[PDB]
Design a protein around this ligand. Sequence first.
Ligand SMILES: CC(C)c1ccc(COc2ccc(CC(=O)NCCN)cc2Cl)cc1
Ligand SMILES: NC(=O)c1ccc(O)cc1O
Ligand SMILES: [Cl-]
Length: 341
Amino acid sequence: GSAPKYIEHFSKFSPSPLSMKQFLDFGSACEKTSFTFLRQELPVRLANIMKEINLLPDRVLSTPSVQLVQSWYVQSLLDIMEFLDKDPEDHRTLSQFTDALVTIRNRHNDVVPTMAQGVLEYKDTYGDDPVSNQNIQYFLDRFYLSRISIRMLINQHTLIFDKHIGSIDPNCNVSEVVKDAYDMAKLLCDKYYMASPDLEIQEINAANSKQPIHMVYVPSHLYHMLFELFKNAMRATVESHESSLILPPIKVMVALGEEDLSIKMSDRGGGVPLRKIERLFSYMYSTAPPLAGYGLPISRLYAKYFQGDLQLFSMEGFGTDAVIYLKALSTDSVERLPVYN
Ligand SMILES: CC(C)c1ccc(COc2ccc(CC(=O)NCCN)cc2Cl)cc1
Ligand SMILES: NC(=O)c1ccc(O)cc1O
Ligand SMILES: [Cl-]
């Protein structure tokens, strides 16, 4: 077959990062334009990461987990090729493309735990030295960020072409998503422990005091990050106080500035020493044989994906602040994509 040839062809192109603006307009031009865009852009994005996978050393590349994921990417690229010559005006072309995208999305559902098995095997077969850790971190941050970007494209297409524009809410109420993610975390926390901390939210709308804070965002991404952070803040608060009786609440501040929309989650879970902070973001050090890959490093990629970030600052003996940084403005919300070279 031609998969290596295709990988070589399409890996010559740079992925084309889109803004919220471009994402919103695609959900007004129409389906024909999304098809002609995606049938070029997905092969570019697939090929770019596949080429990087092929640069891994043979002792990583030859393992079953990487071979299995490499085979998903090959099939998914070939499924998209079928459509390069097809005629956009034929509505049978268009509905078949949507079908093809749903299959591809489903096919890659188990990438995270599959890659996690590759990390476990590497730890036991070659060891867990700091240079191994940086290469795993380098590779998986790029791989998972690439994968987030591909799921975004597919989701926008399949959801729009069967108020919200697919996975985008142009009027996302940040505090509502905070409450949702808290309510779910509380549910799990009450089940596994005899207690759960309460929630306090404070908003700070710098330019428009007391006006509720809204933004253009992908609320499922924001929920994913807030849920992960609530789980950690709840486990820590509960376990650090099981001999205590009082249970400090989790305090969330939502700040809207000129360019940043910032969400701080503060707990009194007794904190972590600075030395152990880097480990919490490490795919390697957080892989082993939360509440009852991994949550923190992947939550940080979701934040990075539209030019944001997620930082942890702890105070050993007191507690931990987690901050999600997002761009306030849809104009500054552009895909961050790993480019091959
Ligand atoms: C996520 C899984 C699949 C996984 C597991 C492990 C790895 C790590 O791969 C390594 C390990 C060590 C080195 C240093 C070195 O000596 N370089 C020589 C390279 N020839 C480079 C790389 Cl790319 C990545 C991804
Ligand atoms: N264990 C911790 O103190 C802790 C870790 C991560 C996080 O997001 C919050 C926390 O309290
Ligand atoms: Cl789209």
